[PDB]
């Protein structure tokens, strides 16, 4: 279960790469910080709170993915 959040974090940041997220410095800077913290995380308490926060960035701009 702990391996899954880091597993899902890598692909979650990957899908934003070709969504022109890096075109904005503000979004990519904080997205990179969130993604790297999950990989270096050791305790399950804080692992989720970056996971939900980073996914909310994808849902912020609906135009990317048709839910």
């Amino acid at each position: 279960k702990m391996s899954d959040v880091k597993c899902t974090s890598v692909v979650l940041l990957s899908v934003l790469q070709q969504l022109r997220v890096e075109s904005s410095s503000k979004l990519w800077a904080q997205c990179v910080q969130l993604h790297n913290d999950i990989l270096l995380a050791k305790d399950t308490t804080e692992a989720f709170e970056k996971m939900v926060s980073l996914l909310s960035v994808l849902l912020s701009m609906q135009g990317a993915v048709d839910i």
């Binding site: 899954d4 597993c7 899902t8 692909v11 979650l12 899908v15 939900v52 996914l55 849902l59 993915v65």
Partner: peptide, 28 residues
């Protein structure tokens, strides 16, 4: 890019997190 997007959503549904499920239904 369709294949990458649809497989990622499978992982999110597989995680079964209340906070993760709350926001995805809110955006839906």
């Amino acid at each position: 890019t369709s294949a990458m997007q649809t497989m990622l959503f499978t992982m999110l549904r597989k995680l079964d997190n209340d906070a993760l499920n709350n926001i995805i239904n809110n955006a839906r």
